[PDB]
Amino acid sequence: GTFKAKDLIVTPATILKEKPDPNNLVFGTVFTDHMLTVEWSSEFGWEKPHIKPLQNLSLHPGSSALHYAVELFEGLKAFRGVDNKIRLFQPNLNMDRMYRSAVRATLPVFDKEELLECIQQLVKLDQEWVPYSTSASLYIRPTFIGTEPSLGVKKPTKALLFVLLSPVGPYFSSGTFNPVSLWANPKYVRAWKGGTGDCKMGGNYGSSLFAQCEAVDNGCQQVLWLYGEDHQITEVGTMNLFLYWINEDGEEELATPPLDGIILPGVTRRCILDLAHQWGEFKVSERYLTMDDLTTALEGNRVREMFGSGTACVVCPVSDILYKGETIHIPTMENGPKLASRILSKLTDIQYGREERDWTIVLS
Amino acid sequence: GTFKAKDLIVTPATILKEKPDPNNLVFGTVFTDHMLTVEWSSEFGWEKPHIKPLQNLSLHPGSSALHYAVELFEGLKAFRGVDNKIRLFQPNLNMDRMYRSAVRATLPVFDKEELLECIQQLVKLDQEWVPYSTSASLYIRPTFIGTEPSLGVKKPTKALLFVLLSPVGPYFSSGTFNPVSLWANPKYVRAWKGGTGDCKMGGNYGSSLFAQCEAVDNGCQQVLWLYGEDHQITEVGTMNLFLYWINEDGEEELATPPLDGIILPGVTRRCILDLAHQWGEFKVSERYLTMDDLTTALEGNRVREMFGSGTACVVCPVSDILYKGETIHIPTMENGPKLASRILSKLTDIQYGREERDWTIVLS
Ligand SMILES: Cc1ccccc1Oc1cc(-n2c(=O)cc(C(F)(F)F)[nH]c2=O)c2ccccc2c1C#N
Ligand SMILES: Cc1ccccc1Oc1cc(-n2c(=O)cc(C(F)(F)F)[nH]c2=O)c2ccccc2c1C#N
Ligand SMILES: *Cc1c(COP(=O)(O)O)cnc(C)c1O
Ligand SMILES: *Cc1c(COP(=O)(O)O)cnc(C)c1O
Ligand SMILES: [Mg+2]
């Protein structure tokens, strides 16, 4: 039916590993002492969850995750506050998105309240892995995979749900904004209408690696995802895309693409539109933006700031775009960046407990 | 570099499993005594291949195949002939397609001649699993996965290449053409231009399970994949699509969609075009076909036969399509099916050694 947090079986590790130095962390390469596992079958339903030492998984080579990408994931953080209390940030929005993605993958449904409480107990046991730095955090990685030992393409009769914990340094080791260059080639598409691009399913990511390898060979750090005959700008790598500018009607506007099927609905993207509506100092539009809209705006000095948004960066400014043989400069870093700074400081003030907020949950 | 077939290390099993009855067999559920494994790293290149007892894989929970679908596969058969010689059918076209898919997924390349000879030693050791029946076969499943223990989205520095063996019955246990109904819903899209739909990469398949669940709920046996504002017919499930008809210009024609990036280039699709070109008895077009093209043709009595093609079926005739709330009948089974029968009998005669061919390899 569903596993229950109150049925948790806890098997502690006998020897603990030494914590790495917080200002030399490489994202997702170091892992904590413990993981969570929960097994499912169609014959016997959900087994009882386990909290046990990190270990390798024992998989049948026939497992449908390794053959037909029957798999999905999530990404959220835990923050050690300035009062030394550990907090989660909008974790219910992550659980909601994981459930929607499971239905679209035909993985078995689960109680969202029971997963989050299991996850809370996993961080509570391993709580010293949450760094003693207000520029560092602990990444939480829920993962859900088909483990059906057969090659037939179908809805799986077996599955594992597991959670990893990995400490991460600041995205900007400098401590202030390093702007990124983008590779813009219309030859590749990330996601299409009628597709799965608005879910965090593994198969959306496997196909982007060739494009990223090409971006790096041409000196860029990320891909700018183009879509359709009018070259709509959609996403920046695995981050949502925002543009602060004077629009076509002469009005100061913050703009992001709409949730029309090809966009991942980011927790950060939701948080930033809510803040922009509350401040009410400028227009806020979920609308379509093209390479023509952007180059026409730069000719008339109308562009202020371009930045990516996600759990990775919070905010990630853009300085240039390579497109049809030329480098196009974006004046983000010559305009402050005023809005990008204000956003970074507000969201970190909420994350690290410098102000009270509906958006945070203290670990009990 | 590459692994080398002459470096093979063989560890035979001490206890062997009992062979299933060939007159049952459910696709991809029974596995042989032995598997092939080859390890790679960026640091030390390709390790030596192994032939050893079937076993579970031991993967780090961080492995890039379980998170970002860094994975691809192939599918080909071995046939026990009427002279009791075991044969492979066009296995060089499977190796060519595996190499192309590896490059597009950023997995390491390998020597195609070395993999095939390792595969031949695998089937030769387990040659009694190749069924004693001219309606049965041994399915061969090469698989290639990223095993990088890290959450970073990038090209893997670690990988496993492995091969599974599974005996399978005839597609239709009766041994005669059961025609299939197709579910045609344009809200699902299999593949887009600028994507990976022309490679056998895992992420292309994970997305299709919900659409197939819906097809079965409405009484159909496969999905008809529609594309674009004009509703182009592309593929039938995981089979290529063929239409035998009088075209617009009054000419007898065999038609199939072009290789413009949203079609998997089937081995059977290759084999069927080569046969049609050789016979020189009617026109052969790789062209676009829409639902309008089809319903205009049916109104004018111009359609003869529609069928799927692949390793699964060889040829799979179509009797109906459900589209915009109506059932549309295709007269495949009232026209013989003459062409579908001629194709099935030629390709099976070559697979089971009832005539000599360029397209087959006797096992050494
Ligand atoms: C949002 C998201 C979606 C899917 C998987 C992981 C995700 O989160 C992260 C992604 C990251 N990443 C990469 O892994 C790789 C590149 C690349 F494009 F440069 F290759 N960019 C990147 O932002 C990170 C890089 C450094 C520190 C943290 C992260 C991070 C977090 N937290
Ligand atoms: C496994 C596979 C993946 C990608 C491409 C081709 C593939 O080959 C096969 C696919 C099969 N299949 C399914 O697994 C599932 C449905 C579904 F649509 F009905 F769900 N149809 C099906 O033909 C088969 C069904 C019965 C006997 C053999 C195969 C088969 C072989 N050989
Ligand atoms: C995860 C992700 C985002 C941002 O989501 P957050 O919830 O803000 O971390 C954006 N685009 C893609 C493609 C993603 O996978
Ligand atoms: C494998 C496959 C086919 C059939 O290819 P064959 O090599 O003839 O078995 C057709 N369409 C898709 C999408 C496939 O994956
Ligand atoms: Mg409940």
Q: Do B155 and A209 touch (CB under 8 A)?
A: yes
| Cis peptide, bond prior to residue A331, ω within 30 of zero | no
Give yes or no for residue B152 CB within 6 A of ligand 1: yes
Of A27, A68, A205, the CB nearest to B205: A68
Query: Does A71 reach chain B within 8 Å, measured CB to CB?
Result: yes
Closest to A303 measured CA to CA, from A245, A243, A241:
A245
What's A131's DSSP letter?
-
| Cis peptide, bond prior to residue A337, ω within 30 of zero | yes
Tell me the backbone φ, ψ of residue B84, rounded to 5 degrees. 65, 25
Chain B hits for A138, Cβ within 8 Å: none
Q: Do A152 and B27 touch (CB under 8 A)?
A: yes
Of A27, A66, A69, the CB nearest to B151: A27
Resolution in A: 2.3
Q: Do B58 and A62 touch (CB under 8 A)?
A: no
């003869």: which residue's tokens? B304
For chain B, state the CA radius of gyration: 21
What's A319's DSSP letter?
E
B5-170 and B180-351 have identical folds: no
Q: List Cβ<8 Å contacts ≥24 apart for B171-180.
A: B171/B312, B171/B313, B171/B314, B171/B316, B175/B135, B177/B317, B177/B333, B177/B337, B177/B340, B179/B317, B179/B318, B179/B319, B179/B320, B179/B332, B179/B333, B180/B220, B180/B221, B180/B222, B180/B236, B180/B308, B180/B316, B180/B317, B180/B318, B180/B319
Q: What is the distance between the alpha carbons of residues A85 and B57, in angstroms, rounded to a whole number?
A: 40
Chain B hits for A203, Cβ within 8 Å: 69, 202-207
Two tokens, residue B88: 């492979």
> Cβ neighbours of residue B334 under 8 Å, at least 6 residues apart?
none
Q: Are B243 and B268 in contact (CB under 8 A)?
A: no
Of A28, A105, A151, the CB nearest to B150: A28
Q: Do B59 and A61 touch (CB under 8 A)?
A: no
What class does CATH assign to B5-170? alpha beta
Q: What is the CATH number of domain B180-351?
A: 3.20.10.10
Q: List residues near ligand 3 (CB under 6 A).
A: A 75, 200, 235, 238-240, 264, 266-269, 310-311
For A27, counting Cβ atoms within 10 Å of its Cβ (0-12 exposed, 13-18 middle, 19+ buried), the class is: middle
Query: Does A50 reach chain B within 8 Å, measured CB to CB?
Result: no
Of A59, A145, A152, the CB nearest to B56: A59
Q: What is the distance between the alpha carbons of residues A311 and A315, in angstroms, rounded to a whole number?
A: 9
Q: What is the distance between the alpha carbons of residues A136 and B92, in angstroms, rounded to a whole number?
A: 52
Q: What is the distance between the alpha carbons of residues B212 and B223, in angstroms, rounded to a whole number?
A: 6
């340094």: which residue's tokens? A169
Tell me the backbone φ, ψ of residue B89, rounded to 5 degrees. -120, 110
DSSP letters for A243-280: EEEE-TTS-EEEEE---SSSS---HHHHHHHHHHHHH-
**CB-defined contacts A:B, below 8 A:** 189
Q: Are A224 and A184 in contact (CB under 8 A)?
A: yes
Two tokens, residue A118: 């299991």
Residue A156's DSSP bridge partners are: none
The structural domains of chain A, with segments of one domain joined by +, span 5-170, 180-351
What are the E-state strand segments in chain A? 9-10, 34-41, 45-46, 50-53, 57-59, 71-73, 76-80, 86-89, 137-146, 158-168, 180-183, 222-227, 232-236, 239-246, 252-256, 283-286, 303-309, 316-323, 326-329, 360-362
Q: What is the distance between the alpha carbons of residues A47 and A28, in angstroms, rounded to a whole number?
A: 28
For B:169-228, CB contacts with A below 8 A are: 186-189, 192-196, 201-210, 212-213
Closest ligand to residue A268's CA: 3
Q: Give the technique used to solve this structure.
A: X-ray
Residues present in chain A in total: 364
Percentage helix, strand, coil for chain A under 3-state DSSP, each rounded to 5: 25, 30, 45
What are the E-state strand segments in chain B? 9-10, 34-41, 45-46, 50-53, 57-59, 71-73, 76-80, 86-89, 137-146, 158-168, 180-183, 222-227, 232-236, 239-246, 252-256, 283-286, 303-309, 316-323, 326-329, 360-362
Q: How many CB atoms lie within 10 A of CB B133?
A: 15
For A:5-44, CB contacts with B below 8 A are: 26-29, 31, 35
At residue B97, what is the residue type?
A: R
> Cβ neighbours of residue A245 under 8 Å, at least 6 residues apart?
A253, A255, A297, A302, A303, A304
Closest to B364 measured CA to CA, from B4, B82, B34, B124:
B124
Q: Do A150 and B29 touch (CB under 8 A)?
A: yes
A343 to A105, A309, A315, A354, B306: CA distances (angstroms): 34, 10, 8, 15, 58
Q: Do A238 and B153 touch (CB under 8 A)?
A: yes
Q: What is the distance between the alpha carbons of residues B248 and B296, in angstroms, rounded to a whole number?
A: 10
Q: How far is the CA of B61 from the centre of ligand 3 (A)?
A: 21
Largest CA distance in chain A: 66
Closest to A177 measured CA to CA, from A336, A25, A23, A321:
A336
Closest ligand to residue A111's CA: 5
Please name the residue of chain B whose CA is at the shortest distance from the CA of residue A213.
B155
Q: What is the distance between the alpha carbons of residues B222 and B364, in angstroms, rounded to a whole number?
A: 38
> Cβ neighbours of residue A326 under 8 Å, at least 6 residues apart?
none
